[PDB]
Amino acid sequence: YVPDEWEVAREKITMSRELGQGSFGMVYEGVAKGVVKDEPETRVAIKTVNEAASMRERIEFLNEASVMKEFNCHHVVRLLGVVSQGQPTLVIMELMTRGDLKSYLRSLRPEMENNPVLAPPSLSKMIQMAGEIADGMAYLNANKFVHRDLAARNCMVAEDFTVKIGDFGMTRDIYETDYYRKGLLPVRWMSPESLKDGVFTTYSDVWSFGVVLWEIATLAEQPYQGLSNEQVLRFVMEGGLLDKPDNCPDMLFELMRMCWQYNPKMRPSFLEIISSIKEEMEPGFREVSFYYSEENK
Numbered sequence: 001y002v003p004d005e006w007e008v009a010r011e012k013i014t015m016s017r018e019l020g021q022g023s024f025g026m027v028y029e030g031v032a033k034g035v036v037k038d039e040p041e042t043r044v045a046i047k048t049v050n051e052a053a054s055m056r057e058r059i060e061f062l063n064e065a066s067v068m069k070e071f072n073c074h075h076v077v078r079l080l081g082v083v084s085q086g087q088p089t090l091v092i093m094e095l096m097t098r099g100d101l102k103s104y105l106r107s108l109r110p111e112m113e114n115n116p117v118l119a120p121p122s123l124s125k126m127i128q129m130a131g132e133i134a135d136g137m138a139y140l141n142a143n144k145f146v147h148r149d150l151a152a153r154n155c156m157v158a159e160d161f162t163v164k165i166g167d168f169g170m171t172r173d174i175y176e177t178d179y180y181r182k183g184l185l186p187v188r189w190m191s192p193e194s195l196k197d198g199v200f201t202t203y204s205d206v207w208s209f210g211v212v213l214w215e216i217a218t219l220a221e222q223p224y225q226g227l228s229n230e231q232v233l234r235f236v237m238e239g240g241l242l243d244k245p246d247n248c249p250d251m252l253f254e255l256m257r258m259c260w261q262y263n264p265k266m267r268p269s270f271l272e273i274i275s276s277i278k279e280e281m282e283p284g285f286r287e288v289s290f291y292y293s294e295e296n297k
């Protein structure tokens with residue numbers, strides 16, 4: 001691994017409580033100095049590798065993390081720095097206190113005790129999440145990337161409830177059942193063309209986005225529940241679709257349906273998705289989004 005402008009002296013990092021498991025190891029919260037301009041103390045997340053990992057693994061952890069270096073969008077989790085000189089190997093990133101979107105959605109399901117409970121997210125809360133996710137995705141596409149694993153588990157929730165495209169390749173061992181080996185495919189999120197030809201584009205990311213909306217509307221139920229992984233492949237490739245979740249506003253299901261057009265060319269783009277809901281976005285969206293930025297053509 002070649003040390004970069006992203007290197008941060010170990011002494012500038014403080015690690016406290018653990019947050020949750022990542023791909024190469026436990027993710028911690030803590031504080032960092034000089035990673036967000038000249039801020040002496042910024043709350044950050046700290047990715048680690050298990051100490052008993054080889055030199056090869058540590059380098060692989062660092063190389064994977066480096067793909068994030070090119071991005072700077074309000075609706076994509078930011079990489080802040082890297083600790084590669086000596087051990088433990090660290091990656092410093094924007095702190096998302098509310099965890100992955102799949103865990104956050106699952107935490108909103110009623111508990112089964114006799115106590116009071118928050119009603120499920122309103123349509124406006126669901127649209128705000130849809131817009132922020134679509135904005136991060138429109139940003140990635142403008143930067144010539146195909147995500148290939150867009151799903152609620154790969155989105156993160158901030159303290160203020162802002163949803164962002166999360167850190168890349170972190171949930172394959174957290175949500176094992178969301179992946180199918182017979183490499184590892186997230187079949188319940190895949191477009192018919194990706195299942196048939198193994199090809200992924202922004203239009204297949206759009207398909208997966210529709211699945212993310214269905215996850216939001218069901219509080220992260222498993223898509224195509226009652227179908228096995230092989231049955232999912234067959235059902236989707238034959239033009240089968242997910243049912244409208246009970247109580248899902250038709251407006252929201254219609255957007256899912258546009259995302260699930262069998263032909264990828266007939267699917268809306270992420271910019272097209274945002275445009276259709278922009279009037280419903282909180283006013284700050286016009287100030288922070290890629291959509292309203294100078295970068296959006």
Ligand SMILES: O=C(NCc1nc(Nc2cc(C3CC3)n[nH]2)c2cccn2n1)c1ccc(F)nc1
Nearest residue numbers: 019020045093094095096099100154155166167
């Ligand atoms: O890291 C993931 N999950 C573990 C986790 N992380 C939390 N917060 C956090 C991690 C990060 C960046 C990786 C450094 N920022 N904020 C957190 C807060 C509460 C419980 N958890 N559990 C993860 C998951 C999906 C996805 F797409 N990307 C990353």
